[PDB]
Amino acid sequence: QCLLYNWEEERATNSCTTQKDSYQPP
Amino acid sequence: SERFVFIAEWFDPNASLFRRYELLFYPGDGSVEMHDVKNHRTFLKRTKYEDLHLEDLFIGNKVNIFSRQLVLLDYGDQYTARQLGSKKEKTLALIKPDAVSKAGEIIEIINKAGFTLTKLKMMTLSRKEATDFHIDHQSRPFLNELIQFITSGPIIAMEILRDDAVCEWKRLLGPANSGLARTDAPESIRALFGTDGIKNAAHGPDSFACAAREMELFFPSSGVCGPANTAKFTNCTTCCIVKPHAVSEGLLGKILMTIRDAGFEISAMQMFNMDRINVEEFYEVYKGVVSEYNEMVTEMYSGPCVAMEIQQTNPTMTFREFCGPADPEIARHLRPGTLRAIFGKTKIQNAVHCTDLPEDGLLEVQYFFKIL
Amino acid sequence: MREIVHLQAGQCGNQIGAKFWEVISDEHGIDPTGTYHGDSDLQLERINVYYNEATGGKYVPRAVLVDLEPGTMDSVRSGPFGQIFRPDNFVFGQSGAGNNWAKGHYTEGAELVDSVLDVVRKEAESCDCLQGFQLTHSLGGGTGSGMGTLLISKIREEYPDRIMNTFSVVPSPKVSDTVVEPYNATLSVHQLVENTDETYCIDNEALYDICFRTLKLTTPTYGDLNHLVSATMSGVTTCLRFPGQLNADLRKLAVNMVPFPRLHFFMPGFAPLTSRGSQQYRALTVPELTQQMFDAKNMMAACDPRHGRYLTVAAVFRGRMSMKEVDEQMLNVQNKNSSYFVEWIPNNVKTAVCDIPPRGLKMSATFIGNSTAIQELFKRISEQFTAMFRRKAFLHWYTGEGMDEMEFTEAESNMNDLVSEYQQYQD
Amino acid sequence: YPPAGAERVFYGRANDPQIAPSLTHGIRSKISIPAKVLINPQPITTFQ
Amino acid sequence: MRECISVHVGQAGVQIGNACWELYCLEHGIQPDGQMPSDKTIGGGDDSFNTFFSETGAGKHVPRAVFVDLEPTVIDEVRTGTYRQLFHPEQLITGKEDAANNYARGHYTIGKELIDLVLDRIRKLADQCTGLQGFLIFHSFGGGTGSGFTSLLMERLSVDYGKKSKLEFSIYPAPQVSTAVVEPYNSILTTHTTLEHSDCAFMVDNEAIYDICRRNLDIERPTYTNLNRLIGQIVSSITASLRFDGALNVDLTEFQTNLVPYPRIHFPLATYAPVISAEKAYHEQLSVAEITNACFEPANQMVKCDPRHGKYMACCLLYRGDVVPKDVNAAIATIKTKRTIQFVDWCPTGFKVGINYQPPTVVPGGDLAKVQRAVCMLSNTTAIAEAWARLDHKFDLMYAKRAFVHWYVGEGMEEGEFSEAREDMAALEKDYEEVGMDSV
Amino acid sequence: MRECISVHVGQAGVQIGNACWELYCLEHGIQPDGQMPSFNTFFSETGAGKHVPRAVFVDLEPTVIDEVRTGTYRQLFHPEQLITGKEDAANNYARGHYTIGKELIDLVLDRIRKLADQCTGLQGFLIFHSFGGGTGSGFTSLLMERLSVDYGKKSKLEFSIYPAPQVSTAVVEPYNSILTTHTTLEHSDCAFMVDNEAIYDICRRNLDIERPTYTNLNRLIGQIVSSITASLRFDGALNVDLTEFQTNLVPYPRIHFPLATYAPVISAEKAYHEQLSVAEITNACFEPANQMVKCDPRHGKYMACCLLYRGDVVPKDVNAAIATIKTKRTIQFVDWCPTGFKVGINYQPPTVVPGGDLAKVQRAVCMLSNTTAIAEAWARLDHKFDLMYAKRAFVHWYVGEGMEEGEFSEAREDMAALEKDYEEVGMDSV
Ligand SMILES: Nc1nc2c(ncn2[C@@H]2O[C@H](COP(=O)(O)OP(=O)(O)OP(=O)(O)O)[C@@H](O)[C@H]2O)c(=O)[nH]1
Ligand SMILES: Nc1nc2c(ncn2[C@@H]2O[C@H](COP(=O)(O)OP(=O)(O)OP(=O)(O)O)[C@@H](O)[C@H]2O)c(=O)[nH]1
Ligand SMILES: Nc1nc2c(ncn2[C@@H]2O[C@H](COP(=O)(O)OP(=O)(O)O)[C@@H](O)[C@H]2O)c(=O)[nH]1
Ligand SMILES: [Mg+2]
Ligand SMILES: [Mg+2]
């Protein structure tokens, strides 16, 4: 709320394997 | 600004790989811009180009830019889908069996209304699809001549893509029965076409949901769709016509009005063609004979063509002389009444391509629908 | 048999070089894929001069393409005729050459010339008989006058026998686009007079003047000018590609128009240039084409040849014409004004003819002339340089890059020696 | 007497339909577009 | 790969940058929450969003700028404003107390605590990118924060980086009016550590921008939001060729060598040509041959000077929109013949042209119309010397009996910097005076 | 390339300009909004179809120009062109020429440069001003001068309103009218002349409309200014440009003060009862009445008249009629003019302005003549100066404002010379 310290952070916050993406069916 | 974005797809002829591009169109100045999505680099920049028209950009349509012919496959964004894909609907049309004598008038009326034809073919359905169109068509009234004519003979069937074509084609028909059409007697297609009520009428879908059932019944998927619907030969069918680019100009309707003069018939109808191997390999007559042969096939590549079956009716004027000489301006100089002086728009690309050798006329027409 | 490599240096030289393929691919029937798409067969008998066959009927241009800014790479890899090019001939440059002769030569061009000489040599030793080199570039900017001028000597170090040709643009007579261009022009012509065998001097206000006084084109878009350069650049090389009843290659233009080894500064031109409204209102024949050929306004230098004497003239004609009308019309204009031609060369003009013109014209030509009046071009920059040199105007960037004041004095002296011997042969 | 934050409107102009914040996508005198030089020395014809 | 980087020091640096980054997100597609505009989809290649933005994994374009200021107040207004999602919060750094119009606090006692953090922040911005081309220093000569802390950012960046070019944008203390009282002190002491530590410094007077809004525009009563939009238009047009395709692009690297003759004369002026209200744009025929004629005329300048009393050395003209290369060439031809405007006689060319294809866009809420063409003039003029001489006279009035000095020298500051800045500034004037005459 | 920037100065000007630019507009076709439902001489094209006019309406007062800025034709004139001040001049040359004027001299001269930098062949500047007010005489003198040095050559014509004979509006006018002579005499390629009282007559004895107002009158100076600038616009046979008029009407460098006389000034309720043949119209300009400056030309020598016709006027009659006027033993011509008449003809007919006093005739003839009768005029006003200057009256202001009593004497001295020159110009050559 009051702008002192880290109030940025307060206000801001208030299935694949290498074979099946390279060796797919041609 | 106000960009038109489309997903392009071109096949490189020696690299047997599919290249996925992103076609940009700029209306108001006619600019074109190819754009690659395989990598993060451009292909073409914002350059003016006049051979593109706004009506040619359709999903599934085939277009030629910079001698590089690509097919449109997807929509680039939701804006073009809202601007074009929201209203562009493909409807089903089927002319009456008794409306064959004015078949081109239905084509001319469809072309003048803005309904471009994408699948307009006279096709003979299979045995299952002959009764499939007769299964949904069921009523207490007598259906003796209404069901017998469709299953055996050929009729002019067409799929037209336009804006709200389901309601636009239904607006063109109006009344269904010929007696009700004669009672209304308005300026409509069903007033001047369609005989004996439901025995032969220009049938149209009542809704887009029921349009799929009607479109699949007449022209199904290419497993049992049927390659041919007319006679392979008639001992005089040595004349075959071709409209490679005149279909996109709206000349398909008027080319049938001007061929019916001097007592010539109509037999065949189709609306599909491909890029290379079905036209280049089978123009073997023109493989080395004709000079400027490259231009002779360039305009055939872009637009799909319709091929026409003609048998010789009167030996006074054959079709080979009715069309005229090779150059369309010479057709103007020889006699303006010939076919290619009337409709020859391009310098050497004609409206109709005939069979030059009379012996190959029966060979060429037997390929186009019986083989395909 | 005979071949020419193509070199593009600088932003100006790149798209004059790129527009060249808008003019010689349709004269050779090459569509923007590399395949052949054309009418006549005689296009494809001497395709080896500019194009190299790749695998599968795909003609790739023989061109070495270098610039030090990436922003000009996309302009030449454009949509129309960009993908015909070999993609690894594109010699990139990350840090831009900041319009300095010293940056193009000493530091920034040093790490790239090692790559350019390797990619020049690949399309130089890979054939049977190399004939010519073509380097289109600029003399105002620091990239064309810094890299091509560095490539004017590194190339000649191991190819001294073979004729090489350059297509240089010069700062315009009155209104120009660069403020440090006399520094670049003086330093560039130091090596262009000692290495180049044929170099055609092209202005920019003359290309405007030929677009209004002759073409009557109310607003020339800026790609229109490079097309008029590339039409002439497609004409000087027409006989080693297309047959003729009396043909002339680059060497035979070189031995005839260069009397002495330091006099190769030429003035080009293209004869049949008509307006749209004067296409119907003008006959196209050999005499009248020649009358527009020697017109001062039809020249690529805005300075008229009245103040000088033509040391040598060559005319290269194209089209099915007669020899006698070529012979008599160049004889008659030789004797009509004999005071504008030098007296110590009696057969002062050279004639060349081809059989096939460029497409769309039944009969054309191209002009290449050596005149004493090109001294006025060089007298401008020599007067402009000494205005900028006695005050040390923009010398901070040149001296800080690794170069002394002795190179500027040597360049000014060699311009003055160049001017002095032109004045010597004026009388 | 301008109160807060904008420009001065002349009194004979304050009660007309303002069209200047609508169509002024194009203000500049657009430079004319000619015929190209791809046509004037390079047309195309044929044998006929 | 052809990108640049900017740092904004001071309240004026960030408030101008508020007006700049509105225009940078309207030229490129990027929405206020750092995103592509949805729907309308520009694709992969199209690499114009690189010179001022950094692309992450998703479509989150993050600007290439760090906004450092010792006051929290104006930075926090940016951080709570309509662009809170655009700037990365670790780029929106802030100080603790302001320098409070004090050069000593901005350089020695308050400016030394952020100097390690701002150099680390620029270094990872520089490490993330590869094709660095220039630096854009946005600040003001008036205050002690924006002029004292940038003196560190002019010197530490010169030692660490060096050969890479680095451009400066500043607010000239106004000639007739002034904002504060200690402004002539803060103005000239930075020049000792700005002269040999910079490549070019675009100098801008806010009082002339008042005169532009009064006459060229129809808007009396200008707010600072309206003033900094003109500066945003200028900074967009200098860097327009670095991002956008043009017939004659000019890179930032050759921009120096065709503007600054000598390594000490690096103070160009600015001029934006089509500063026309929307109604008068509906009236006037606007064309190339008269729009750069309006650049040279004294009533469209951005700094109080006089082209009729000051001779130009080199002129850099940058065009936008529907420009064609003779239209400048006919315009240079008709203005070389003008006997009102004088150049220096040892520079016969005296011109650099810049041609760009895409016209400027206008931010909503402004007064400019969507004009299809624009000119930005950046000229070295001898008339900046008499703008320096009045500021040296303003300093001498206070320094005659040594007033407003105990605020400086008490905070770790000496009097030798006051002494040496006078003959340093005298070295500016004698270098700008010796080019006034030509040798016959 | 037949442009003609037209600086309108003084209430007379900004009240002669509304009527004059209304004709132009109603002629070429430009509506009171530019958008048109040749035009270059007066109007200038913009990006779209907004043909903005090309003038520099000026007035050190802020009232009349403010009406235009709020009047009917409002969006036509550009906010800038209509330059205006904040304090009047108060019929005192000194003010408009030595004081207040100095302030608005830059704004106007500068805007003039801009209207001129968009011209590719300005054929000449026209100044429309009064000769008895402040901006009328003071500012005009200034603009006239600076414009002479800078724009140079460019013909400078001054359509103006000279103090009338007996009728008048101001008492300090005589001084001004003569204190603005060393301006015209020198800087003024050719100065036409009008006279309120004279136009009241031509709009009462010819227009039938009695009680005429400034509008009813201004329309006639506008119809006249539309015949000198007719050829440069609409085409015709013998077409005379602003330069020609001069090289056929200025018989000597100094003597450049012609007298205008429109001819077919008739009411529709009468023009439909006459033949109005070239003959008739012609004989009118040479009748001592239609003259627009009370100076009966039967007391002078018609040096070089310039008959500029318009409409359906075939050259044959133009020659026959001219001959009849050249054999009338009632007109009288200088010996040094064997010829005498410059006949021009434009097919475009005169245009009728809604609510106009004139009629839609099919032929018209403005006859710019150079007589030795303009002398008589400068002589009447001359006396009205010596009568007041004697008792150094109304001189306390001028001298204070910022000038010297010396100038007053020089004005009358210079004026005196003009009258003498005019006398020797037309003396039977012996
Ligand atoms: N052009 C422009 N100048 C500004 C703006 N805001 C403040 N200034 C100038 O900045 C000067 C004062 O310095 P500031 O920028 O306000 O603050 P600072 O730079 O952080 O320095 P300090 O005042 O010590 O905190 C004044 O002389 C103003 O002229 C602005 O929005 N636009
Ligand atoms: N009859 C007649 N007289 C006119 C007309 N216009 C101007 N005048 C005369 O010219 C004189 C000039 O008046 P103004 O134009 O107002 O004077 P000014 O030039 O503005 O000078 P200041 O009033 O001192 O500012 C008037 O007093 C009239 O007598 C007109 O249209 N008809
Ligand atoms: N034909 C042609 N000439 C150009 C072009 N751009 C610039 N020029 C000429 O080249 C000069 C500028 O040199 P430039 O090539 O831009 O320098 P560089 O970028 O360092 O190579 C100018 O004087 C122009 O006359 C262009 O696009 N086409
Ligand atoms: Mg502060
Ligand atoms: Mg008044």
PDB file of C-alpha atoms in Angstrom, chain E residues 215-216 276 279-287 289-290 293-294 296-297 299-300 308 338 340-341, chain F residues 33 35 44-47 50 52 74-81 106-107 110-111 113-114 117-118:
ATOM      1  CA  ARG E 215       2.226  29.839 -32.942  1.00  0.00           C
ATOM      2  CA  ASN E 216       2.752  26.670 -34.998  1.00  0.00           C
ATOM      3  CA  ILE E 276       0.608  21.770 -37.509  1.00  0.00           C
ATOM      4  CA  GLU E 279      -7.607  22.096 -38.462  1.00  0.00           C
ATOM      5  CA  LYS E 280      -4.807  23.947 -40.289  1.00  0.00           C
ATOM      6  CA  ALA E 281      -3.637  20.667 -41.729  1.00  0.00           C
ATOM      7  CA  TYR E 282      -7.132  20.468 -43.265  1.00  0.00           C
ATOM      8  CA  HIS E 283      -6.290  23.785 -44.962  1.00  0.00           C
ATOM      9  CA  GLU E 284      -2.625  23.986 -45.990  1.00  0.00           C
ATOM     10  CA  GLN E 285      -1.172  22.289 -49.000  1.00  0.00           C
ATOM     11  CA  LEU E 286       1.815  20.523 -47.480  1.00  0.00           C
ATOM     12  CA  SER E 287       4.730  19.487 -49.702  1.00  0.00           C
ATOM     13  CA  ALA E 289       9.794  21.811 -51.112  1.00  0.00           C
ATOM     14  CA  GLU E 290       8.268  23.973 -48.364  1.00  0.00           C
ATOM     15  CA  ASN E 293      12.022  25.396 -46.025  1.00  0.00           C
ATOM     16  CA  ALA E 294      10.135  25.618 -42.730  1.00  0.00           C
ATOM     17  CA  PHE E 296      15.527  26.533 -41.673  1.00  0.00           C
ATOM     18  CA  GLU E 297      13.301  29.492 -40.819  1.00  0.00           C
ATOM     19  CA  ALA E 299      10.335  30.595 -36.052  1.00  0.00           C
ATOM     20  CA  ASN E 300      10.311  26.772 -36.185  1.00  0.00           C
ATOM     21  CA  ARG E 308      20.169  34.561 -39.947  1.00  0.00           C
ATOM     22  CA  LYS E 338      18.703  31.372 -50.817  1.00  0.00           C
ATOM     23  CA  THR E 340      19.169  34.604 -46.451  1.00  0.00           C
ATOM     24  CA  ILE E 341      20.657  31.339 -45.145  1.00  0.00           C
TER      25      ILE E 341
ATOM     26  CA  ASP F  33     -15.954  25.551 -48.116  1.00  0.00           C
ATOM     27  CA  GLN F  35     -14.717  21.417 -51.815  1.00  0.00           C
ATOM     28  CA  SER F  44      -4.436  26.758 -54.291  1.00  0.00           C
ATOM     29  CA  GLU F  45      -5.111  22.986 -54.336  1.00  0.00           C
ATOM     30  CA  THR F  46      -4.535  20.933 -51.174  1.00  0.00           C
ATOM     31  CA  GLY F  47      -4.222  17.175 -50.635  1.00  0.00           C
ATOM     32  CA  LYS F  50      -9.827  21.886 -50.514  1.00  0.00           C
ATOM     33  CA  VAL F  52      -7.707  27.318 -50.188  1.00  0.00           C
ATOM     34  CA  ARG F  74     -15.473  30.822 -42.992  1.00  0.00           C
ATOM     35  CA  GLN F  75     -13.694  27.490 -43.605  1.00  0.00           C
ATOM     36  CA  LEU F  76     -12.459  28.784 -47.010  1.00  0.00           C
ATOM     37  CA  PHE F  77      -9.782  31.256 -45.787  1.00  0.00           C
ATOM     38  CA  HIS F  78      -6.892  29.687 -43.795  1.00  0.00           C
ATOM     39  CA  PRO F  79      -6.779  30.816 -40.066  1.00  0.00           C
ATOM     40  CA  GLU F  80      -3.298  32.202 -40.723  1.00  0.00           C
ATOM     41  CA  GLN F  81      -3.756  34.272 -43.937  1.00  0.00           C
ATOM     42  CA  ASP F 106       6.865  40.718 -39.983  1.00  0.00           C
ATOM     43  CA  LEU F 107       3.834  38.394 -39.613  1.00  0.00           C
ATOM     44  CA  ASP F 110       6.557  36.344 -43.676  1.00  0.00           C
ATOM     45  CA  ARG F 111       3.176  34.784 -44.577  1.00  0.00           C
ATOM     46  CA  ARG F 113       6.822  34.582 -48.532  1.00  0.00           C
ATOM     47  CA  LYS F 114       4.950  31.312 -47.830  1.00  0.00           C
ATOM     48  CA  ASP F 117       7.045  29.862 -52.134  1.00  0.00           C
ATOM     49  CA  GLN F 118       4.091  27.707 -53.295  1.00  0.00           C
TER      50      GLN F 118
END
